[model samples]
Each structure stands twice: as structure tokens, then as C-alpha cells.
Target chain A: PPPIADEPLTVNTGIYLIECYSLDDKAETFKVNAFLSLSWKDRRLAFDPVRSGVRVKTYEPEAIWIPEIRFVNVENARDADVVDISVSPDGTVQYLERFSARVLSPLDFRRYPFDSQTLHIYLIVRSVDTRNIVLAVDLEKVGKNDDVFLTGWDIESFTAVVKPANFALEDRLESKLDYQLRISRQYFSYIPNIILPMLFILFISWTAFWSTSYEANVTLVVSTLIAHIAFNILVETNLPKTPYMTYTGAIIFMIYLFYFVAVIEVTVQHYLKVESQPARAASITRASRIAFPVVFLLANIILAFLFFGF
Target chain B: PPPIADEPLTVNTGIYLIECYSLDDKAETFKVNAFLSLSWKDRRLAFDPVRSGVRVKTYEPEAIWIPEIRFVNVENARDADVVDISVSPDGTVQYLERFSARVLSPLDFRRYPFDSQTLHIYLIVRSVDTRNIVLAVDLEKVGKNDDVFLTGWDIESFTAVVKPANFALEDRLESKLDYQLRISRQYFSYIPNIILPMLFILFISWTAFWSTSYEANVTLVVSTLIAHIAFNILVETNLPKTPYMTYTGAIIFMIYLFYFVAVIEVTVQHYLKVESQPARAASITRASRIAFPVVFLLANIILAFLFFGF
Candidate 1:
């Protein structure tokens, strides 16, 4: 059951069972942690656990990106005075953090179509100081947020409640979601262009085994190396590092494996050239023409199929 | 034996060692491949393999930043029509590619030491109408550039032989060494700053095992966790990704291990508080003080041993 009116918010530091989808008017729910951040000087935020709430329960999606957050404090706050905070994907602010009479109210994209894979939110608080603010987000409550919210990465809906001076009733609260898919789509744009071209180039390179002349065989192998190098540079430029494997890296590794196929081509070509008989050269070339394509194709497909289940 | 004076210049795609103490001196020699770049329309020249030389090799200091490269094509014909193309580590034209034209008569930088590590050469050529030039460089020849002329990673001395360039009777090429020690000191700046701090943090984390806690033990364990997390984020921001064990990643693992120590501290604190044993708590806390300092000292020594073989 949802918390009753005037109930104290109790945040625990371990796992909680959350509903993935709403029943009737209820919304989808997932587990989250209430993490706390401690500031040392500037450029440093020490994460504190006693001040944090962690959940061990598994979340179905395994990952989430927050789109935006908004907070409003009515008067003197224990942490800051007359605080009103807003968080967004874009770091736009209406007030300077150094001013005591400032308001930092930001909003996320969750006010639109709701999803679970955007990079917009993670709750934050603004302060009246020139230095960096240490951020700790409340994560204990995981539940459905209803009435048209933003599309977000992990949860369906979220809202933050702010307390006023003397813990009065004048405090304000708000929430948003990710409706726009433009940013997420752009982030993954390299998937089709970079990956497929590399695979085609790899197949072309493996055909070097079918060539009769030594130099002609080496030509395809060298060109494949050059092509793969260029592709690797392009992919690196496009993507940011995340903990898990990306589609772009997957295609790059595929090209590397194809380049390795050149070793067989180099060996076979050298052998035929050494044997130096017209009949033998013709036979070797013909055999490789049939076997190389079939074996290489099968290997490529099997490897990709087995691991790319990701 | 090295190539004789009478031998014609022929370039190949393989490693060659070169030494030059003078520009005008015919006796000084260097070896580089005749890297050929020919357009589809210029395929005839590529097949001939004698019009111009372009060398191909890997770029090194694999993890370091990329340096700037500059190129120019000097015209050999009196009408200054037919051009010679080359690249240089220094601003001098002494190290010209064979069949490459030398436009200027002579230039000098021997007074200023050359940073051989920073000096790389790649040539780009385009036809007067539409000649597109591609470059190949010899990377293997770049290491340990000179034994006697200069020391360390700085520029020692360099030379090049340009065809149809100006030379007079009894012109002797001379190499000058920069006495300022510019190359050695400048090369040190390229070493990334993250190396030493990472090692220091890793040492303290490993020594965390030595501490025993009782009274304020919770504070000690929490402090370690906070420090570990801070270091983890710091290391992550500094380095690029590779498959093998990285210095930063290895150090960050200490944070997890230290978090477990915090748990141990809390458990010990709980047992004493439950029993209401003031003496035991005092004894344990005293022991912890000695423990942390000792471990910290031991950790430093062990780290030194591991790195220096002392």
C-alpha cells in the first residue's frame, strides 16, 4: 500500500520488490538506491554509505538513464537557504549558486512518452556556493508515476518533495520524463553505417585466398588491415565508454577476426608459389576459391550468432 | 654491407637503419622505402615503382598523443615545374627522399637538438592538375635514434640527400648538437601525471587489511570507502580502455575490498556494544590506532618493493 498522509518517509539501504508495470491505473515500478554524496573540496565528491540507501533486489532492465528532476524549497533549508532546484538533461540554470536567495528549479523529459533507456535524470540539489555541489539522490521508493510522464531509462515515473523552513507545509515538488527520442537515436547512429561496411570489406579480403599470384593475394590482406584501422578510428570517435559491450565495438571485433583470416591466405599463397607448377597452382587456387568462401562464411556466421545474442 | 656510393637508389617496404651527420656530405647515408602513391590514372607510374618513394610503417608511442606533421613538394626542374615531395621531423630539407626534388639549396637546425621521438615524416603529393599523394613512414627505425651524437629522447642530428639540389666544390656537411638539454626535459612532459598518484592510492588501499577497529571503527571503515570511491572515479576519468589489466582498474578494486573492511569494523563495534564491555572497546580502539599506522607504513614499503625489485 502507498504511504498514508503524514507518514514519515522511511528509506532502507537494501533491495525492495517493485512492480514492473501498473495494474489498472497503477504505474510500472523498479528498485533503486538512495545514494549520498559528500563534498571534500572542489573536483571531489566522496560517496557515503551510512548516508546512503542501497537495494539488492534485481531490476529487470538492469540499467537506466534519468532525464530530468525538479525541486523547490520554500524558505530557509538546513542545507541551504530559500532553495528551489531543477535538474535537466541540459545544464541550464536560471540562478547563480552563490546567491542565498536563488532558486534552482530544473525539469526532465519524463512528462512525455515513458521509456526506460534515456540519459536525462538522476536527482540533484543546487546550493548557494561557488564550489561544486555534492549530490545524493533518494532511491528507496520505486513505484508507478501516473498521469502522462516523461520517458525515462529505469522507472516509469518519479517525483521529489521539498521541505520548507521549519519543515512547514509550504514546500513544493515536481517531476518530468523523456518524450523526445532524438538524443538516444543520435547516440546509436553508428550501428548501421560502421558495422555493415566492415563486414563486407572482411568478406572481400578473405577472397584473397582465391588469387593465384603472391602479390595479388597480399594486396587484399593489406587493404583489409588498412580498412579495419580506419573503421576502428571512426568508431572510437563516435562512441563514449560504458561498462558493457556496445554494438559498435562488436562490429569492430568482427572485422579483426576477418583480418586474422588473412593468415591462412598468406600461408596458402606462399605454399603454392613455392610448389611452382602450373597444374598445382591452378588446383590450389580452384580449391581455395570453393573452400575459403564456404568455411569462412560458416565461421563468421556461427561466431556472430553465438555471442551477438546480446 | 651498406649501399655503396655508386649503387642506384632502390626502395622497398621493409626496415632500414640510417645515420646522417651532415647534409652536403655525400658519404652520409640513410635508408627509407620508395613508398609509391598513384591514382587510378597514374597506375602506370605505380607499376614502374621508380617515379617517387613513399615509406609505410606503424605509428608508435602507441598510447601517447598524436603530433603535428608538415609536408611540402620542392620542384627540381629549372622552370621549377616537376616537384619533389617529402616530410621532415625538423624544418630542414636535408633528409630528402631519393628521386625527390630539393627546392632550397641548404638549411640547418643542428644548433638546436632534434627530438627524434617527436619527429616523424609522412609525405603527401598531389599532381599540379590533381595529384593526390599518400604517405608511408618507417616506424621501426625510430627507437634509440643515436648512441654517440646525443643522449636521451631528444634530437641528436639528421641529414637527407635531395636529387638535383645545390652543392658546391668541397662542401662538407656538419651536424651540431644542442647543449641546452631541451630534448630530455621536454620528453618527460609526455608521461601522463596519473601514474604516481595511482600507485600511492593503491598502496594505502592494500594496507587497509592491517587495521583493527573497535570504538570509532565505523568512522575508519567509512573513511576508507569514501577515499576508494573517489580514487575510482578519478582513475576512470584519466585513462582510455584496453582489454588487459590497467593500472587504474587494479587500484580501484581496493575500494570494494575496503568496503568489506567497513563491514568488519561495524560487526566488531556491535559485539562490544552489546556486551557493554568498556575495557574491551578501549583496548580494541587503541590496538586499531597502532594497526592503521603500521599497515600504512608497510604498504608503502611493499609497494616500493613490488615496483623497484628492492
Candidate 2:
């Protein structure tokens, strides 16, 4: 074997494995496994263990922080995609580890032992195209080098109850990388067909009512609701869930909401017209025909953002 | 840090890293890059690394091999849930010496060194669920114990390789548990509204079409096609992609095919009738209509199995 490299030690390069034998406060022996990977490409190993309850992140340092670990199975992965893993001492390779850790916890730095301040550690494992590994450790040791094998073992048995020199890093990164791309295809599809058409159809209904009397308005509302039902059912066939907003179910829902508003406005206005309250009836009709289109339009936009974006 | 266990190492105990390094035939340097892991639910690490790759198998008594140590890192990682890493030279409080090696070729244990007669190495990391440490490592020994070290110089230093083994086993358990629940919901939704309804519709269509008169028959074909179109669009919305026959989409498509055949039969029979060939028209009409339904039904079953079932 060749000799080890002669360079200043930095924390990003080596692989480390942590096995926990005692889990609960009761201190009974149990096995807990976790992994961290900082890789540049989406290699297969990053994904293979995924079904077995493993997480993989493709590391890209210059990426946004998204707090999610998304992965595709090896069978589903495209050809030649690669991922990098920070090789742990246990010879374990990995890409992402998702845990809620405090990134800025104070720690004693060997170089700066007395200076205690909030330190930040961020795992930029997921990028727009690339994946990232997000980890949390203590700040003072964020860039500190220590004997990984020795720091957290009992000197007597090399067992648990050992502490590394500092705390684990904690800052969180919310990635829009894989998660966004995945759900977005449906998003784009709906925006054009379901969402846009529903909005336009509602507008057409509202405007058509303006040029007609109460009888036509009632007819239009019924037809619009039925059309909404058709589109809604079609959307439901594709999605796993039928959340009110998700899977274009929202378009059907909004059509109904607007339809109800139209019915109520016309019904109430007609009642007043029959009662000889001409001003009130006219005022109600004008207000409703105009207000519903605007409110409905704005509500659809707001609902789309809230349901789909989030 | 602690003395070796008095108990002899067995498959039930001890940790192993199957390290792979290429030999520089011209130079003395061994280019070590890839490694796999094995540990005891049983005991002992005793597998020979091969020229093609590493041959990982169950450890047995007859062995005359030892692992070559390029470098190692030891740490005192507690709390986050990892037991001490098994190293050749076991001890307490030591940093792993990092090194560098090229990624010669990507190794898939399933297809390495030839697929047919390959020895398989499997690593099963069970979660103790202590503080789940995401296992990560480095070639250059940078950041062996700490988070900020890299092996090479500058920001673009040595590669951080992470295997799937690095994810916290707890995370995998959580995700699997959640998705299982989600998939169960799919099954529940599928059997009733999707499966039963679809089969019911197809069965009804089959019986109804066979019993109906000629004028009604044509209208049935046209109306059913329209319904099929609506249902097809609906099915498209619900399913992303299916490996095999989904009850809903498959049935709808079959109905449409029947419609197409019905149209063809009508055209040819009418042409014969116009030429005053009453016998030929009547014979052709009966034969084609019978053939169309039979073909439709048969194709539906065969295609359903071919496309949807494995």
C-alpha cells in the first residue's frame, strides 16, 4: 500500500461511520445506523440502498438549502448519472443524511478553545440538477480535525458514551432539486389544461351572464359545474390522492365555489326585483357580475400557489 | 481504546471493511479507491479482494488473508448513534489518515468481474437507532473526525465518497413506514372505485352490445366511444405510468377499440347492401359484428396481460 497523503487535514474528505449500541436514556443496547455522503455525481450506490431505508444525496456545494431527501431507484435512474459520498471510516459511502440538527451550536475549537460563538454547518447536497448531502454537527468542529475513531469511544471498551471534540453541525438547507422536478411535471401539465381552462371558462360564464338575464345565468352555472365535474374526474384518474386542491381537483372545486356565488347573487337579486326593490336588485346584479369574476380569479391564483407551490 | 474482546471473533460479531486498491504494475503504489463493509450479527472479516473486484461472501474458518491498511481514522462520536468502527488496529481517540485515489471504474457488486459466476458480498446495517450518525468517509483522510476537512488543497479538494450505508437506518425506516401507508391507501382506492367499476363497465358493455338491435347497436358504439374518450382522459390524469394492466385505463381502451371495429363493419355492410347484394350484406353484417366483439374481447384480455401483467 502507498503511504498516506501529506496535507493539512480538512473535514470534508474522509468517510466516517457511527454505530450506536445504547439508544434510549435507559441505555439498553440497540443498533442505530446513519450515513453521510458528499459526492459530485449520482453513482448507483447512492440509490441502491435507498429502498432498504437509506438516504442518498448528490453533493453540490453551491446550491440552495432544501430540507428534503429525494431519490430515484436504480431501476428508474438514467444512464451515466453519478453521485458522491463522504467515505466514512467504516468504509460506508453515502450522499445525504436528513436529521434536524442545530447548525450553530457552540463548541470548543482546539485552535480557539476559549472563544465560544454560534457556528454554522450546512449540507448543500441537492442542487437544481445535482443532489446534495445535508448534515448537522457542532460549529467549533465544523472545520476542525480530530481523531474520528477515538473521540467518541469509551477508552475502556471502545464503546458508546464518548463525545467528539465538539457538537454536530446544525443549519438546515431546503432543496428544490429533486422534489421540485418530480412534482413539477404535474404542475406544468395542470397549469395549461386544468387550471387555465377552468379560469377562462369561469370568466366566460361570468361575462355571458352579464349579457343575459337570470334564466340564462342559471343555465350557464349548471353547465359550468358539469364541465368542471368532467375535468375533475379526469384529473383524479392520474393522481394518487384527491385533495381538494391537489390533482386539479381544485379547478372543479373553484368552479363550484364560483357557481354557487353566481347562483346566490342572481337568486337574491331576483327576489328583490320581485319585491319591487329595483335599485337594490340592480345594484346587487352589477356588484355580483363584476365582483365574482375578480374575486374568483384572484382566489384561483392564491389557491394554486398555496396548494401546488407548497 | 479498549482491549480486544476475550470472546473469539465470529460472524455474530466484529466489523469489516472490504477495501479495494488497484496495483500500479509499473510503480510501487497501490491505487486504493473502493471498499465494501461486513459486520457480525455474526463475526470476523475474512474475504480476499480480487483483481476484477472484491469477492464478498460469508466469512468462514479457512482463511489466509489480511486487510492492508492505507490509513484509518478513529473518533469519539457518541449521542448521534453509532458504535465504534472496527479497524485493523483498534484503539481509542485517533484521527483517520486521509489519502487520495482515482475512481478507475464504477463497481456494481451485482455485475462485477463477470455476472454469472461472481461471488456476492452483502452488507446489512441494522439500525440501533441511537443518535443516527450518517456514515461518511474520505480518501485523503481530511475531516476524519471533524466536518470541515478535505484531503486535497483548496475548495475543490479530495472527493467525499459516501455509500448508501451512510444514511441513518432510522430515516429509512421512517420513510418506508410512511410510504407503506401511502401505498395501502392506493390499494384501498384501487380495488373498489377503480377495479370493480372498470370490470363492471366492461362486462356490461360486452353483454349489452351483443343483445342490442342494429340501429341501437350503432348508437351504442358511438356513445360508448365518447364515454371511452372521457374515461381515457380521466385515466391519463390519475396514472403517471403503469408497468402493467391497470383496471381503469385498460378497460376504457378496450371499449374504444370495439367502437372502431363497429364502425368498420357498418361501412362495409352498407356498401354491400347498396349494390343489391342482400344475401352478402346480411351475411357480412352478422359475421363482422360477431367477429368485432369477439376480437375486441380477446384482444382486451391478451393485451391486458402482455402490457400490464409481468
Candidate 3:
């Protein structure tokens, strides 16, 4: 690498993984505990460890020369401590520092609860030229809270890479390392919490097809419709507001269509009976009893395949 | 005012509004057409306007001692032109420039369509010392697009104020100026587009009480319930996403309740007849015909008062 203008030392930047406490969708930010690293070489400070019988020598980070690196796209960040300071006598200096940071991440909520996102944490030497300092990462140091499980989401995968920093300044690319944590929102609890109640409401409406009396059928179907509305309110409270339709919205829409069709079926059957068409009424009722559940099941299967299978 | 360190000029900043093109809710930003002004007293530069038979004098901004000022909360800004430049015989300099700017503002959507909001645009000196530069607004020059109306909102009022800049590295009492535009959302279109259809649906469900035939009642009530759902979906699409209940949500809930009560009334009447209670069944049918609409109207009046009165 070419020597940086006004600086003789060559420096590289890296990071270590720590706990990600939360991702606040409303606030559009994520909280993390991480460690930033800086390594450099100075030929004038060279010394042999074997001959001197010293494996390492340490000094206060402020007492030695360290690059002035800062976060470029961070909301807030704080330095915890300089965890390690090592000089391997051959003029190589490695410094490790911990931090608790809150970073801003623009989320794509088109998929909402079924969505996965990548969080980027960037570091840059503001005044340094790109050609002078190159960025690198230690893949082994990156990790997470593997033992403790999170609610609603599972960390699918994570990656760290250094790319060009292109904010406001040109000809001065900085160390832009990102942690791509593919978080898949867990919907297992939601199936019981939301889908099961919806299915119950759907089945209750279906009972109208089997009932002999129109009055009793109207009671069952209308009561189920009311129940579905209440359940939808419950679902809406727990979800982030987005303009696009989500998986939940899709299922609720299907349930509404099913309930409406059930009402129409019963109404048509009643009309047929009132007009003295007994055979037709009985035939239509029998057809609905079989066709309703079958169609509902098929529609659900297709929607599920569209959302989760592929 | 104290002379700013390393600068021989004192400066003040102000603005004149021209138009507001658009406000993007998704991005939480707005674009405005406006002019920025800088004024100062320079003893070395003095010119007589009418005496020289010249109204104004022009010079490149960079060639003079101009304070480095910028918008503190702007997303993007572009300078259009130096509209005018003048110096009085008393050595007072005034410079006017036009520009289009996009500014970021945090929006509160708790009340949503029924909500009124204030948008703020702030400007501050970027590098100059605080005591040396003061900020102000030309109140008479602040104008807007009076003929151009927004679709869902009306410009209720607007005001400008200069305040202390308390951001990073600045002293306790630095100068910053802000423009506040208060906007009120219009509910006229929403009444026809969202509320009236819902009211129609609610009244249609009430027709169940009037009909003597159970088949006719079922057809009327069920169709209305399904219609209500479709109308609700339309309203949700146009409204901003929020976790809390809106006035629209309240109206929809009431409609659902009314539909459910209609079903229960019919079911009870049928049960009384089957149990050989003719008098009771007749009494309920008579009562519901009068009670249903009265209760619905009363509930709607109370809700309207709650949402709109205060």
C-alpha cells in the first residue's frame, strides 16, 4: 500500500461481534454491543520478543499513535474501553476497543413480519485519503448471543464486509464494514394467536350452511363475522403500520370473502325454499356443505405456498 | 455583537417563502421554494444608489466576507441565484439568493386524518462564532401558494421564529431560525369516501328489523356486512399506519356491533316463536323496529361529538 500523505504509519480497521439487544421498528434503529479494532506497523519501533524474553508490551492507547476513526452513519455510539493493546516487538501494534452503539437502519416493511433485514455499521477516517489506508475484517471474532433465543425473530445468518464509503466526500473511501444479520420473524406463535382464531370464526360461519333454520344460521354467521372483526383488531395492535398488505392482511381478507360467500349461500338456499323449490334448495345446501370447506382449504394451501413455501 | 474570531464581518440570515411543492410522508420530508438573505455592515464597502444613478451593486459571494451558514435540519439544498446585492452609503450590505430545499421533519400521526400537524425548517450558521451572527426572519416577505390547494390538507397558519442553537460544539446561546407551518387535514372527501358508505352499510343492516321475511333479512344484513369490510379496506389504504385506534376504527367497530345486535335480535324472535311464545316474539319484533335505529343514531351522535366536537 502507498504511504498516506502526512502520515508514515500504515493502519487497518476491523471489528468483533457482540450482542444485539433490540431492533426498534418504530424508531428505525438497532442497538448493538461491539468492539472496534485498529492495527498498524511502525518500523522505527521494532524489537525482538525472543531475544528480550518479552512476549508482549502494552501502553495506554492515548499515549500511543492511533488512527482517528469515527462512525459515519451512526445515530449514537460510545467507547467502553480499550480492551487490548499489544506490540509484538516487530513494530506491529494492535488495539481493541469495545462500544455500545445505536445505529439507524432504513427498513423495508413491504413484507413486514415475514421480512428479513441487514444492519450496517460503518467506520471511517474522516480526513484520510482512500489510497493511504486499506480496510480489513477478522471473520473469526464476529459472533452473537447464540444461547439466548429472541422472541418473534431468529438470526438466520450474519456477514461482515468492507466497502467504499460514499457519503459527501469523494477520493476518500473509508472503512465501511457491515453486519448482515438476516432476521426471519418467527410466526409460530402468531399462527396460534391469530390464524387459529380466524379459522374458528370461518368454521363457525360455515355452520350456517348445515343449519335447517334461516334464523339460526343468520345468528351463527353474523356472530362469527363480528368475532372476526374483534380478532382483526387484536392483530392490528401488535403489528407495525405499513401501507402494503401483509401476510396477516392476506389471511384476514380471505376469511372475509369466505364469510360473505357463506351468507350468500344460505340466503340463496332460503330464497329457493320460500319460492317452493324444495329439491333445488336441498341440492344447493348439500353442494355448499362439501364445496365450502374444500375451497377454503385449497385457498389456504395456495396462500401458504405463496407466502412461505417458495 | 462581538466580532467573530478569525472573521472581520458580522452577519444575519433570513428567508422568504415562495411555494411548497410536496411533502412525502414516507420519507418524512418536504420540498420548499424560497430565498435566503444575508445582511451585514462593512465600513470599507459603501456605495450611493441614486447618487451614482445605480439601484444596486453586485459581487460574487465568495469574493466578500460572508459567514458560512447552512440549514441545520435540511436533507438537500441547492442555490438558484444571487437575486440582488446592495450596499448603502452607511456601509450596510444586503444579499438575496433563491434556492429549493428538501427538509426532514418528524411527523406525529397519532390522530392521522383527523390530525393537524406542524412542519419545521431550521437554519443556522455552520462554522462562524455564535455571538458574532444573529438570525431573523422577514415576516412580511414570508409568502406561500395561496391559490394552490393540497388534496387532503389546508395550510392553517404559518409563523417564523429565531431561537438558540444548542447543537454540538456550539455555545449555550447560539442563533438558529425556524419556520413553522401548521397544516390541517380536510375531512370533507373522507366523509363521502369513507364515513358515508359505512353509515349506509350500518343503516342497511338495520333493515333486518323492518323486514318480516327471515330470508329477506339475511340477504340484506349479510350483504351489508361484506360491504362494510370492503369499504374499511379502502379507508385503511389511504390512511397512515399507526398502532392506536383512529376515529375511523371507532366507527367501523360500532358498525360491527350494530350488525351483531341485529343478528341476535332476529335469532331471539325466532326462538320465542319456536317455544310457543307468540306474545314475547311479537313484542321483541315491535321493540327492535323502533329501538335499533334510535340506538344507532344516538351512538353515532356521541361518537361524532367525541371525535369532532372538542
Candidate 4:
């Protein structure tokens, strides 16, 4: 049988973010560069190193009774190094470590480019029973690298918390600490690269309403349709999969519906002209030239409200 | 300090899949129903079942020297039952357990709709030193439920293997066992719902080449564009995101290009008519009507070969 400790132990944990590389949807993981520190108070292990002007003592970590702690959802621990070990006057033993790991974190892409996410460093005690050990977090000291900048996301806040969890049985509870960083994606590039291009194409298609030549109208509308397809594909392939509909998807659907309306208008105009009612055809196209933009803007507002107005 | 075992103990492990459900991409976890059996030969412990018809004795698992084996990546163990305990005539003891667990598994969606994935039941021996207790797997008996049916995936194969791992130092090697199930996604629905519809829209857009009335031609092309947009949005929003292009993306891009070509043809025909060349406009439209389908078919074959032939 595995040895069970009789004395309860306390472990302190902290995290500092250095950088975030990529959030992969398919692999359901994100890569990060971070520094971590684990500390504990062991009153029986105090040492007097001040006489030699050495305030700390370091040793190989494997030869100790340290609790088995693991990142519960880590996918791949790319690199890890034990940078420093120190002993304080009050019998405080601390281990400082740095790692560049690809961690497993669940991501919600429902809001997508406008979404916010919380990346967690979930820590758990593996070997010890709850009665023999507990985990703690230094919340006030929890911080992120201020100099770190993400390509498409803005770091909002950093927080840490300790919670009690039941591991093997319902009656026994163990402590778990979580360090989280809140981030919101920046859609600056998306506006120019995806939204603007799509809107521009729709505008081009709208111009067909002002033309008298059915040939010109068809050519313009088809050209707009082609451009929209290109932009839609660009955005679609780049986003992660979700079961629910998103604002971006709704916008594309709206544009598709608008394109259908434009075709219907053109067909009606052609029908009137073929009946030798040129006056009616001209009047209808003329009214649509103004009606198209008004309806489009209104629909855009409604969609914006439904998706992000809150 | 935790107790470390003194003797090198060998343990045999086996797993059989009962059912699998809720393979979620967003959560990056899958649920499984299965039974696990662990056996060990203890020469000191022999049983006489013929006299009393009692082949086994039960005790609290934590009170004895049992391997601390765990599914290292499991998120939730929904159900676990110690269903059977038996002793063989040769002093061998076995414990059979049934579990329905939600296991954390990293999924790669690079190929996505055309991808095959293997779900693993990764096991690790915790607490005990590898030098004292080593894990082993009986690969020949690793099996899966023949009656199991997944919504969109086909189970292809099941296999198990034992691997040596070092948790602390290279000198201390531990044995790890893994049970793997290979499954391939069925893309039959995607073809009819996403691919076929986009191609059909492209075919309709191509018919614009036969129309002499620019109005009718424009209407046909715009309608096709509208239909394609609807289908593209449906697929794009529902599928998982990927950085690289997929076969579906490639096909949509091709169709967009084809639509552009149709628009260009109509534009050229209108230009000829506006230049007071009716005969040339009529001849160009006639040539395009025949040329469009030929070019479209040839492009389709090339794309199909590039995406799926090999």
C-alpha cells in the first residue's frame, strides 16, 4: 500500500504570465510562457544559514516529501526548469520554476472575435489524501506580465482562488487552487480584412439597382456574389467550430438574404420591361436604388443589437 | 514522507470498451463505457474454493498493497463499480471494475470531416516507485464493443500497449499502459448537405452564358450566388475551425472563381452590344454557353483528384 502521511501539509502556489502564442481550436489547447512558484511552511525544517551570509539552501527536488502537484488539464509540457530554491528565516521553502507549455483549456467561440475567455492554471494534489494535505494560493501576488502583448487578444485581468474539492469520496474534501487570466479578442484586423471587404462587395452589388441594362445588373450582382464568397470562405475556415450560431454567421446569412432580394428585384424589373412596360420597370429600379441601402443599414443595426448590443 | 514499496511487483491489466458517447470538440473530452480488470500473482496467498465454495475474500482496497493505477486524463468518472473479485487455483487474484468516465483527450481536427482519430485510455501508476511496482498490459485480449454505434464515427480498430516512462529521473523507469480505439468520421451527410449544393449553384450560375437578355442572365447568376451563400454559411458556421484550407474550402473557392468567370463573360457580351456589334455579342454568348460546362467539368475533375484521389 502507498504511504499515507499523518500530518496535514500546506502548499502555496503562484503564477505569472509571460506570453501567449496561439489558441488552437482543433487541438483544444493554448501555448503559454509562464513563471511559477510553489512555497510551503515547514517549521521543523528551519536552518541557520545567516552566519555564512547564505540565506538559502538548494537541493534536488526529487529527494523530498513534496506533494505531487500537476496541471490537471495539461496537454504537453514543452519545457520546464527549476530556476531557484530558497529557505527563509521563518522556515519558508520555495521553489521557483519556469515553463513554456501547451495546456489543455476549453474555449468558447460562440461570440468568436468578440468573445472573452478565462485561461486557468488548475492545480491539484495527486498522491496525498485530503486529510493529510491542503493547497493554498497567494491571491494578492498573482500577476501577469505587463510587457507581454498578444497578437489578437487583450489581457484584461489576472486572478487566483482556492477551492475545496472532493477527490475519491463524497465525505473527504481536498483543496484546489486556480490561477486565471481573462482575455478579450481584438477584432481590429477582422473589421478591415473580413467585415469591410464583405460590406464593400454588397455595396457593389447594390449599384446594379441603379443600372438600366439587365446585363449590367447581372454582371455587377454576380461580381459581388463572387467577392462575398471569397471573403466568407476566408472567415469561415479561420474560425473554430461551434454548435450554436454566432454573430458572424448571422451577418453572412443576412447578406445572403439581401443578395436574394436583389435578384428578385432584378427579375421583376426584367418582367416589366419584357411586357413593354418600360415606365414601370424604370420606376421600380429607381425606388430600389434608395430602398436597398435603407433596408441594409436597418438590418445591420438589428443584427448588431442582437449579437453585441448588450 | 509517503511509503515506497520494497519489492518489485508485476501487475497485469486489461480493458474492453462497452460504449462511447458525447465526443465533444469544444470541451476536448470524450465519454466512454468500459470494464477494466487487474490481476497479480501472489504465491503466498492460495485459496481452497472446493470446500466452502468461496474462491475470494474482500477487504478495503486501501488496506493492502494494490497498484495505484488511474486514468491520468480522465475529467469525470461518472460510474465505477467493483463488480467482481476472484482467485485462481494458482494463487492469482483479479479485480474487475466497470466505469463510465468522461476522459480528457486532445483532438486534432486538421483533416476534420475526412479525419480518423484514436481515443486513448491512458493509464499511469501513481504513488508507488517504478522500481517497486511495474505495470503491464495483455494486448492480445484488448477488445471493443461490437454492437457499439456512434452518431458520425465508425470504429475501426482497438489495440493496447505498455510503455516505459520516467516521472522523476532517467534511472527510475515506470511502466504505463494505453488502450486505443481508432475511429473514422463519415462525411456522407456533408457531401449532400454542403458540397453538392454549392456545385449545383455553380452549375446554375453557368447557365447565364446561354441567355441573350442581359436581365435574365443577371437574374440567373445572382440567384445562384444567393443559393451558394446560404449553403456556404450553413457549412462554415457548423464546422470546426482550422488554420489550413480543407477540401470543402477549396471547392467553394473554385466555385467562386467560376462565378467570376461567368460575370466576365456577360460583361464582355454587354460591351460588344454597346459597341454596335450585335453579331459579335450573339456569337460570344453562343460560344460561352458551350464552353462554360466543359471548363466547369474539367475543373471539377482536377479538384476532386487533388483533394481525394491519392
TM-score of each: 0.27, 0.28, 0.58, 0.60
Can you write out model 3's per-residue Cα lDDT over A145-229, one digit (the tens) per residue?
Answer: 4652435577776565655443322222334455556676665676677778778778878877777677777677767766776
Q: What ranges in model 3 sit over 4 Å off?
A: A1-11, A24-29, A42-55, A71-74, A88-91, A106-116, A128-134, A145-148, A165-174, A271-283, A308-310, B1-118, B121-131, B134-175, B179-310
Which 10 consecutive residues of model 4 chain A have the lowest summed lDDT? A166-175
Tell me which of candidates 1 and 2 scores higher on DockQ.
2
Q: Of the candidates numbered 1 and 4, which has the greater TM-score value?
A: 4
Clashing pairs in 3: none
DockQ of 3: 0.06
Candidate 2 residue A234 C-alpha distance from true site, Å: 2.7
Worst 10 residues of 1 chain B by lDDT: B173-182
Q: Which prediction has the highest DockQ against the true structure?
A: 4
- Better candidate number, 2 or 3, judged by lDDT: 3
Cα-based RMSD of candidate 4: 11.7
Model 2 C-alpha lDDT versus the unseen true structure: 0.34
Of the candidates shown, which would achieve the greatest TM-score relative to the real structure?
4
| Interface RMSD in angstroms for candidate 3 | 10.2
Sort all candidates by lDDT, best to worst: 4, 3, 2, 1
Of candidate 2 chain B, the 10-residue stretch with the lowest lDDT total is B175-184
Distance from true location, Cα of A74 in model 2, Å: 25
What lDDT tens digits, residue by residue, belong to model 3 across residues B1-310? 2223445344666665554535666576766656577788765666775778344455656655665567767875554556445565666767766566777877765555577879887766544343444556454335453423333367876667665454545443345667787887654544433454356446647556644465657666776778688767756754556667777778777888877878887777777878898688878878987888888789878987887686
Q: 2 or 3, which is superior by TM-score?
A: 3
Task: Give lDDT tens digits, candidate 2, residues B217-286.
Answer: 3344334434544555645553332223334444554554454445445434544565578677678665
RMSD of 3: 12.3
DockQ of each: 0.01, 0.02, 0.06, 0.11
Candidate-wise lDDT, in order:
0.31, 0.34, 0.63, 0.66
